[PDB]
Design an enzyme around this catalytic site. Structure first.
Site, PDB file in Angstrom:
ATOM      1  N   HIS A 149       0.771  -1.240   0.000  1.00  0.00           N
ATOM      2  CA  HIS A 149       0.000   0.000   0.000  1.00  0.00           C
ATOM      3  C   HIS A 149       0.792   1.275   0.000  1.00  0.00           C
ATOM      4  O   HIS A 149       0.342   2.361  -0.383  1.00  0.00           O
ATOM      5  CB  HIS A 149      -1.129  -0.109   1.031  1.00  0.00           C
ATOM      6  CG  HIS A 149      -2.176  -1.014   0.439  1.00  0.00           C
ATOM      7  ND1 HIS A 149      -3.257  -1.495   1.085  1.00  0.00           N
ATOM      8  CD2 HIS A 149      -2.220  -1.514  -0.814  1.00  0.00           C
ATOM      9  CE1 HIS A 149      -3.948  -2.265   0.266  1.00  0.00           C
ATOM     10  NE2 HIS A 149      -3.331  -2.297  -0.903  1.00  0.00           N
ATOM     11  N   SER A 175       0.718  -0.899  -7.001  1.00  0.00           N
ATOM     12  CA  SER A 175       0.724  -1.849  -8.063  1.00  0.00           C
ATOM     13  C   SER A 175       1.449  -1.488  -9.339  1.00  0.00           C
ATOM     14  O   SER A 175       1.219  -0.556 -10.078  1.00  0.00           O
ATOM     15  CB  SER A 175      -0.670  -2.395  -8.234  1.00  0.00           C
ATOM     16  OG  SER A 175      -1.371  -2.177  -6.986  1.00  0.00           O
ATOM     17  N   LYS A 214     -14.109  -5.758 -11.272  1.00  0.00           N
ATOM     18  CA  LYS A 214     -13.129  -6.705 -11.795  1.00  0.00           C
ATOM     19  C   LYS A 214     -12.927  -7.866 -10.841  1.00  0.00           C
ATOM     20  O   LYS A 214     -13.020  -9.012 -11.233  1.00  0.00           O
ATOM     21  CB  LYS A 214     -11.749  -6.143 -12.067  1.00  0.00           C
ATOM     22  CG  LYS A 214     -11.525  -5.830 -13.520  1.00  0.00           C
ATOM     23  CD  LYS A 214     -10.253  -5.120 -13.875  1.00  0.00           C
ATOM     24  CE  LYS A 214      -9.322  -6.014 -14.712  1.00  0.00           C
ATOM     25  NZ  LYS A 214      -7.944  -5.417 -14.582  1.00  0.00           N
ATOM     26  N   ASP A 215     -12.665  -7.523  -9.592  1.00  0.00           N
ATOM     27  CA  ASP A 215     -12.465  -8.522  -8.558  1.00  0.00           C
ATOM     28  C   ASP A 215     -13.668  -9.434  -8.387  1.00  0.00           C
ATOM     29  O   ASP A 215     -13.537 -10.661  -8.335  1.00  0.00           O
ATOM     30  CB  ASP A 215     -12.113  -7.897  -7.215  1.00  0.00           C
ATOM     31  CG  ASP A 215     -10.630  -7.569  -7.167  1.00  0.00           C
ATOM     32  OD1 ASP A 215      -9.983  -7.658  -8.233  1.00  0.00           O
ATOM     33  OD2 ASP A 215     -10.118  -7.230  -6.082  1.00  0.00           O
ATOM     34  N   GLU A 273       1.360 -33.997  -3.834  1.00  0.00           N
ATOM     35  CA  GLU A 273       0.411 -33.599  -4.879  1.00  0.00           C
ATOM     36  C   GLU A 273       1.062 -32.589  -5.801  1.00  0.00           C
ATOM     37  O   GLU A 273       2.152 -32.069  -5.580  1.00  0.00           O
ATOM     38  CB  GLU A 273      -0.915 -33.110  -4.334  1.00  0.00           C
ATOM     39  CG  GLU A 273      -0.818 -32.858  -2.838  1.00  0.00           C
ATOM     40  CD  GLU A 273      -2.142 -32.851  -2.120  1.00  0.00           C
ATOM     41  OE1 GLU A 273      -3.193 -33.115  -2.739  1.00  0.00           O
ATOM     42  OE2 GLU A 273      -2.161 -32.556  -0.902  1.00  0.00           O
TER      43      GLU A 273
HETATM   44  C1  HEM Z   1      -0.927 -15.921   1.178  1.00  0.00           C
HETATM   45  C2  HEM Z   1      -0.850 -15.645  -0.115  1.00  0.00           C
HETATM   46  C3  HEM Z   1      -0.985 -14.240  -0.699  1.00  0.00           C
HETATM   47  C4  HEM Z   1      -1.949 -13.314  -0.587  1.00  0.00           C
HETATM   48  C5  HEM Z   1      -3.303 -13.425   0.143  1.00  0.00           C
HETATM   49  C6  HEM Z   1      -1.551 -12.180  -1.377  1.00  0.00           C
HETATM   50  C7  HEM Z   1      -2.217 -11.034  -1.615  1.00  0.00           C
HETATM   51  C8  HEM Z   1      -1.952  -9.970  -2.350  1.00  0.00           C
HETATM   52  C9  HEM Z   1      -2.850  -8.942  -2.854  1.00  0.00           C
HETATM   53  C10 HEM Z   1      -4.318  -8.920  -2.415  1.00  0.00           C
HETATM   54  C11 HEM Z   1      -2.147  -8.124  -3.638  1.00  0.00           C
HETATM   55  C12 HEM Z   1      -2.571  -6.888  -4.458  1.00  0.00           C
HETATM   56  C13 HEM Z   1      -3.030  -7.176  -5.895  1.00  0.00           C
HETATM   57  C14 HEM Z   1      -2.160  -7.786  -6.936  1.00  0.00           C
HETATM   58  O1  HEM Z   1      -1.131  -7.245  -7.378  1.00  0.00           O
HETATM   59  O2  HEM Z   1      -2.445  -8.914  -7.423  1.00  0.00           O
HETATM   60  C15 HEM Z   1      -0.784  -8.610  -3.707  1.00  0.00           C
HETATM   61  C16 HEM Z   1       0.254  -8.057  -4.432  1.00  0.00           C
HETATM   62  C17 HEM Z   1       1.544  -8.551  -4.495  1.00  0.00           C
HETATM   63  N1  HEM Z   1       1.927  -9.781  -4.017  1.00  0.00           N
HETATM   64 FE1  HEM Z   1       0.757 -11.089  -3.028  1.00  0.00          FE
HETATM   65  N2  HEM Z   1      -0.299 -12.406  -1.934  1.00  0.00           N
HETATM   66  C18 HEM Z   1       0.060 -13.674  -1.523  1.00  0.00           C
HETATM   67  C19 HEM Z   1       1.223 -14.284  -1.941  1.00  0.00           C
HETATM   68  C20 HEM Z   1       2.323 -13.727  -2.561  1.00  0.00           C
HETATM   69  C21 HEM Z   1       3.626 -14.401  -2.817  1.00  0.00           C
HETATM   70  C22 HEM Z   1       3.903 -15.852  -2.477  1.00  0.00           C
HETATM   71  C23 HEM Z   1       4.426 -13.399  -3.264  1.00  0.00           C
HETATM   72  C24 HEM Z   1       5.828 -13.473  -3.817  1.00  0.00           C
HETATM   73  C25 HEM Z   1       6.764 -14.263  -3.331  1.00  0.00           C
HETATM   74  C26 HEM Z   1       3.596 -12.216  -3.438  1.00  0.00           C
HETATM   75  C27 HEM Z   1       4.063 -11.016  -3.914  1.00  0.00           C
HETATM   76  C28 HEM Z   1       3.277  -9.949  -4.249  1.00  0.00           C
HETATM   77  C29 HEM Z   1       3.757  -8.777  -4.921  1.00  0.00           C
HETATM   78  C30 HEM Z   1       5.194  -8.511  -5.402  1.00  0.00           C
HETATM   79  C31 HEM Z   1       2.707  -7.935  -5.105  1.00  0.00           C
HETATM   80  C32 HEM Z   1       2.671  -6.541  -5.792  1.00  0.00           C
HETATM   81  C33 HEM Z   1       2.630  -6.448  -7.315  1.00  0.00           C
HETATM   82  C34 HEM Z   1       2.354  -5.179  -7.975  1.00  0.00           C
HETATM   83  O3  HEM Z   1       1.185  -4.782  -8.008  1.00  0.00           O
HETATM   84  O4  HEM Z   1       3.329  -4.559  -8.467  1.00  0.00           O
HETATM   85  N3  HEM Z   1       2.295 -12.403  -3.061  1.00  0.00           N
HETATM   86  N4  HEM Z   1      -0.703  -9.751  -2.926  1.00  0.00           N
HETATM   87  C1  HEM Z   2      -4.766 -22.274   2.778  1.00  0.00           C
HETATM   88  C2  HEM Z   2      -4.700 -22.757   4.066  1.00  0.00           C
HETATM   89  C3  HEM Z   2      -5.189 -24.239   4.058  1.00  0.00           C
HETATM   90  C4  HEM Z   2      -4.902 -25.071   3.093  1.00  0.00           C
HETATM   91  C5  HEM Z   2      -3.873 -25.007   1.941  1.00  0.00           C
HETATM   92  C6  HEM Z   2      -5.579 -26.326   3.422  1.00  0.00           C
HETATM   93  C7  HEM Z   2      -5.414 -27.527   2.749  1.00  0.00           C
HETATM   94  C8  HEM Z   2      -5.889 -28.739   3.197  1.00  0.00           C
HETATM   95  C9  HEM Z   2      -5.734 -29.986   2.487  1.00  0.00           C
HETATM   96  C10 HEM Z   2      -4.934 -30.076   1.190  1.00  0.00           C
HETATM   97  C11 HEM Z   2      -6.345 -30.938   3.178  1.00  0.00           C
HETATM   98  C12 HEM Z   2      -6.501 -32.430   2.862  1.00  0.00           C
HETATM   99  C13 HEM Z   2      -7.917 -32.844   2.428  1.00  0.00           C
HETATM  100  C14 HEM Z   2      -8.022 -34.124   1.640  1.00  0.00           C
HETATM  101  O1  HEM Z   2      -7.397 -34.171   0.547  1.00  0.00           O
HETATM  102  O2  HEM Z   2      -8.779 -34.975   2.192  1.00  0.00           O
HETATM  103  C15 HEM Z   2      -6.944 -30.305   4.347  1.00  0.00           C
HETATM  104  C16 HEM Z   2      -7.711 -30.924   5.323  1.00  0.00           C
HETATM  105  C17 HEM Z   2      -8.291 -30.365   6.436  1.00  0.00           C
HETATM  106  N1  HEM Z   2      -8.220 -29.015   6.696  1.00  0.00           N
HETATM  107 FE1  HEM Z   2      -7.476 -27.565   5.500  1.00  0.00          FE
HETATM  108  N2  HEM Z   2      -6.362 -26.148   4.540  1.00  0.00           N
HETATM  109  C18 HEM Z   2      -6.122 -24.866   4.955  1.00  0.00           C
HETATM  110  C19 HEM Z   2      -6.723 -24.237   6.040  1.00  0.00           C
HETATM  111  C20 HEM Z   2      -7.489 -24.917   6.979  1.00  0.00           C
HETATM  112  C21 HEM Z   2      -8.152 -24.282   8.099  1.00  0.00           C
HETATM  113  C22 HEM Z   2      -8.074 -22.794   8.375  1.00  0.00           C
HETATM  114  C23 HEM Z   2      -8.790 -25.224   8.809  1.00  0.00           C
HETATM  115  C24 HEM Z   2      -9.626 -25.067  10.086  1.00  0.00           C
HETATM  116  C25 HEM Z   2     -10.239 -23.912  10.385  1.00  0.00           C
HETATM  117  C26 HEM Z   2      -8.533 -26.479   8.128  1.00  0.00           C
HETATM  118  C27 HEM Z   2      -9.056 -27.672   8.541  1.00  0.00           C
HETATM  119  C28 HEM Z   2      -8.913 -28.869   7.885  1.00  0.00           C
HETATM  120  C29 HEM Z   2      -9.462 -30.135   8.348  1.00  0.00           C
HETATM  121  C30 HEM Z   2     -10.246 -30.376   9.646  1.00  0.00           C
HETATM  122  C31 HEM Z   2      -9.039 -31.057   7.471  1.00  0.00           C
HETATM  123  C32 HEM Z   2      -9.315 -32.552   7.565  1.00  0.00           C
HETATM  124  C33 HEM Z   2     -10.416 -33.282   6.868  1.00  0.00           C
HETATM  125  C34 HEM Z   2     -10.343 -33.328   5.365  1.00  0.00           C
HETATM  126  O3  HEM Z   2      -9.576 -34.127   4.758  1.00  0.00           O
HETATM  127  O4  HEM Z   2     -11.133 -32.488   4.865  1.00  0.00           O
HETATM  128  N3  HEM Z   2      -7.747 -26.270   7.013  1.00  0.00           N
HETATM  129  N4  HEM Z   2      -6.635 -28.957   4.351  1.00  0.00           N
END
Ligand code: HEM
Ligand code: HEM
Lengths: 81, 62, 48, 106, 111, 22, 49, 379
Positions: free
Chosen positions: H201, H205, H227-228, H271
């Protein structure tokens, strides 16, 4: 701080816009898309497509060999001898 | 002259956002029912007699 | 193995119709708003 | 000893220049620069004409980008017209700072 | 924000008080202009090509009199509500509201 | 003022909503 | 104080005297054929005898 | 000001980063992955909390528990298959995100880049533990072989693998740990996301052209809220298309088999979102060499800022890197393929050259290409 009054400095530029309700949101879309889609794809294709093509060959060959070498159980060395 | 269907609709229901919203609530209702009805029908047609609804007869009340 | 087989395909059907009504609709919204921008034309008149 | 080689780079150069699409956008090479701390100061050093120009150019350019439209063939930036107008300004800014750095050794 | 705001309020929330004060302002505006010879001459000339050959001067007060807070509210909402603006600036217009923002200012969800 | 008529369609909406939605 | 507080909270994870009761404790013999092989679970990995 | 709702509450002002913020005009569709990124984080969470409203974290039951969520519980089936599939999306989206950053030089925002990276890796942990919760043959083994891959470290390793597991194998002790950390990571990650947003912020962007847009800025509310929402609409589409029509398709693993510790699917693999790193690991004979190189796969991200060689943060105007950028992506696809491949000659030899290609593309080719292009422009 403040993001709108403080971005940069711009002198002498006019802009002209119209209201949504006065215009159409879909401007000869088929006609523009084809030619624009066409014109950028063809400027992308060369820079983008190659490496994918490559992977495909490597995929193809790469799987053939496997099946061969493994299905060709006699491949390594023959039977008669 | 008369108002296009839209203009009619507009002045009766969309000027005031209270009306607009009221509309949408109503619409959401009506719509859900028709959709379902239609969209369920369509889907049951594609599986005639494949589904228990079709097949209950056989073992029902003798 | 998958007792939900039929229900899920059912919903699929209802998610596909719906999505065919929301995807086009929502796109129009998106052009309604942006239109001003895309329709926009520019002029540059320095005193120079 | 560059007569054939360095009178042919212009050939790749020319190729390359029109390869990079910015040509088409109505932009010039100097306007494609990464705006960092030195560029920034150079930028600030520009005359009203030069400098307002760079603002319209980028305005017209980001407009095009937003609409995915290329400028007409007739209105494109020709390589032969390489206004390296930032270069002069940009050099010094660096020049000043290199000196500053150096003066700080001991 | 404040201005558009005023507009909206006007066509939904006008109060008799408020309209009655503006009413009276109008009278004065409309009487005091007519002080002097030049002023009367222009009203009479221009009145004739504008409104045709009438001189609605005494009528005014009557017409102005029919003013009601409901009258003023319904009359304003024809022309300002849901209607699309005509906006020009001569910058620093860098902060001037986006056409769509201005537009949405002519209807009342919130703000 | 306009608030009754507006508060009366806002009333309706909530009602219809609950009725239906719930 | 930190040291002993942190230590305890890490050890909480280290290995419970539940699990760690069964660890290192295993015997069996003479109940299987003079010929076969009996795969025991032992320490999560296959204990072949 | 008076009765300007927004800045009245101080809290509600903080929300005007959505509505009032300067957003560049020009902006590929690619940036919608930020927003969707959040979308996915919120969907997993709502989904997770309901599944964890009927899941148990024991050896005995866990398989049963999931099995019961998908059978007797009302709309538990979609919730679970929505949760599984989601995570796919979540990753599909993540890797668009990082692509964009790689390509247009959004990564110039070093501080934002470093948070991203943390983000990426945190989710990575999450996904690794959740998949093990259901305690099925794939999960069971996958945890062993990954975790054990930590025992490569010479002095500690060994002790440390045993602490993480809570014992000598992966029995109950480990299984409840993953349940707890899976649960609490996503909450911690949301804090990170917001912290990420915070930093971003402060500079707004970047764009396809690669130049500042300050001279062209637009209302985020008017334009970018639709858009979003539209982005969503397509995002959901994909998530339901998957979840409704082909629930298992994208979930390679067919191992719905309760884990038997002597049994083994000779074909053990993470996976799809982990395959790259798997492949890269196998290419090294030595264990330890493979763990280092696995970390470096992912951890190599934070270098790229320093690697940047060109004067145009935008790849948009630079051919040669646009070619090697694409190739890396297709090399990355190539690696993903290897991941589901028997570890035999054919695949070995291929993976090995792909793992060198990837590090060349990132470490050596691109950086040079940068220079070249700069020199052709006379820069
Ligand atoms: C938990 C996962 C993530 C969330 C929720 C998230 C969220 C956001 C959002 C909402 C924006 C603003 C809009 C946009 O440019 O698309 C943003 C921008 C950005 N994100 Fe992420 N992001 C995540 C993961 C990452 C990762 C893994 C990286 C790089 C290693 C990354 C790097 C950036 C950068 C560089 C920008 C700014 C780009 C620009 O507008 O010039 N983000 N992120
Ligand atoms: C992005 C963050 C998270 C990711 C990437 C994620 C991903 C996953 C994946 C890949 C599995 C395996 C399911 C299957 O193939 O059977 C799983 C299972 C599960 N996750 Fe998530 N999860 C996330 C966040 C959460 C959160 C926030 C909760 C609780 C509030 C949660 C609760 C569970 C539970 C209880 C299971 C077990 C039962 C099942 O297989 O569905 N996870 N999660």
């Amino acid at each position: 701080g403040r993001q709108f009054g403080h971005l940069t400095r711009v002198r002498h530029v006019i802009t002209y816009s119209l209201s949504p309700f006065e215009q159409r949101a879909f401007p000869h879309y088929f006609s523009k898309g084809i030619p624009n889609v066409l014109r950028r794809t063809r400027a992308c294709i060369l820079r983008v497509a190659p490496p994918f093509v490559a992977f495909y060959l490597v995929y193809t060959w790469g799987t053939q060999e496997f099946e061969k070498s493994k299905r060709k159980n006699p491949a390594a060395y023959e039977n008669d001898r | 002259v008369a108002p296009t269907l839209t203009a009619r609709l507009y002045s009766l229901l969309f000027r005031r956002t209270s009306t607009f919203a009221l509309t949408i609530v109503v619409g959401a209702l009506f719509f859900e029912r028709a959709f379902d009805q239609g969209a369920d029908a369509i889907y049951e047609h594609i599986n005639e007699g494949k589904l228990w609804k079709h097949i209950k007869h056989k073992y029902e009340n003798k | 193995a998958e007792p939900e087989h039929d229900h899920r395909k059912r919903m699929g059907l209802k998610m596909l119709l719906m999505m065919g009504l929301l995807l086009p609709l929502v796109y129009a919204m998106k052009r309604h708003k942006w239109s001003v921008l895309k329709s926009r034309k520019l002029a540059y008149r320095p005193p120079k | 000893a560059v007569s054939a080689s360095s009178r042919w780079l212009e050939g790749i150069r020319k190729w390359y220049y029109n390869a990079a699409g910015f040509n088409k956008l109505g932009l010039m090479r100097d306007d494609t620069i990464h705006e960092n701390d030195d560029v920034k100061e150079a930028i600030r050093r520009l005359p009203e004409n030069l400098y307002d120009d760079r603002v319209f150019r980028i305005k017209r350019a980001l407009d095009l980008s937003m609409r995915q439209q290329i400028l007409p063939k007739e209105q494109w930036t020709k390589y032969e017209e390489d206004k390296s107008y930032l270069e002069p300004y940009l050099k010094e800014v660096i020049r000043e700072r290199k000196e500053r750095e150096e003066w700080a050794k001991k | 924000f404040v201005l558009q705001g005023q507009w909206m309020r006007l066509c939904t929330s006008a109060t008799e008080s408020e309209v009655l004060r503006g009413k009276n302002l109008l009278r004065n505006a409309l009487v005091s202009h007519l002080d002097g010879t030049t002023p009367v001459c222009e009203d009479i000339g221009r009145s004739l090509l504008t409104y045709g050959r009438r001189i609605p001067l005494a009528e005014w007060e009557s017409r102005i009199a029919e003013v009601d807070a409901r009258v003023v509210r319904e009359v304003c909402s024809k022309y300002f509500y849901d209607q699309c603006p005509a906006v020009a600036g001569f910058g620093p217009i860098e902060q001037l509201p986006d056409y769509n923002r201005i537009r949405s200012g002519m209807f009342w969800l919130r703000f | 003022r306009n608030w009754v008529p507006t508060a009366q369609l806002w009333g309706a909406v909530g009602a219809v909503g609950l009725v239906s939605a719930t | 104080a930190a040291k002993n507080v942190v230590s305890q909270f890490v050890s909480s994870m280290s290995a419970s005297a539940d699990v760690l009761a069964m660890s290192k404790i295993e015997i069996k013999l003479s109940d299987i054929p003079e010929g076969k092989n009996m795969a025991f679970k032992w320490r999560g990995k296959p204990l072949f005898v | 000001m008076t009765n300007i709702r927004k800045s009245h509450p101080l809290m509600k002002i903080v929300n005007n980063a959505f509505i009032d913020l300067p957003a560049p005009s020009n902006i590929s569709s690619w940036w919608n992955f930020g927003s969707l990124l959040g979308i996915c984080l919120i969907l997993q969470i709502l989904t997770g909390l309901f599944l964890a409203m009927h899941y148990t974290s024991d050896t005995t039951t866990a398989f049963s528990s999931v099995t019961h969520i998908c059978r007797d519980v009302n709309y538990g089936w979609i919730i679970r298959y929505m949760h599984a599939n989601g995570a796919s999306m979540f990753f599909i989206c993540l890797y668009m995100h990082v692509g964009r950053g790689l390509y247009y030089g959004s990564y110039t925002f070093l501080e934002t880049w470093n948070i991203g990276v943390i983000l990426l890796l945190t989710v990575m942990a999450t996904a690794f533990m959740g998949y093990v919760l259901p305690w099925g043959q794939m999960s069971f083994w996958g945890a062993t072989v990954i975790t054990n891959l930590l025992s490569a470290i010479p002095y500690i390793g060994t002790n440390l693998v045993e602490w993480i597991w809570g014992g000598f194998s992966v029995d109950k002790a480990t299984l409840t740990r993953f349940f707890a950390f899976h649960f609490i990571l996503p909450f911690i990650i949301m804090a990170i996301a917001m912290v990420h947003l915070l930093f971003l912020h402060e500079t707004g962007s970047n764009n396809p052209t690669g130049i500042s847009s300050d001279v062209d800025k637009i209302p985020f509310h008017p334009y970018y809220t639709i858009k979003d929402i539209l982005g969503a609409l397509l995002l959901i589409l994909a998530l339901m298309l998957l979840v409704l029509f082909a629930p298992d398709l994208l979930g390679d693993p067919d191992n719905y088999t309760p884990a038997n510790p002597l049994n083994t699917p000779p074909h053990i693999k993470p996976e799809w979102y982990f395959l790259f790193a798997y492949a890269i690991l196998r290419s090294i004979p030595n264990k330890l060499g493979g763990v280092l190189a696995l970390a470096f796969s992912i951890l190599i991200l934070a270098l790229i800022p320093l690697l940047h060689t060109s004067k145009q943060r935008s790849m948009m105007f630079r051919p040669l890197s646009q070619c090697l950028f694409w190739a890396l992506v297709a090399d990355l696809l190539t690696l993903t393929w290897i991941g589901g491949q028997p570890v035999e000659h054919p695949y070995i030899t291929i993976g090995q050259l792909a793992s060198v290609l990837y590090f060349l593309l990132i470490l050596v080719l691109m950086p040079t290409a940068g220079t070249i292009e700069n020199k052709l422009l006379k820069w």
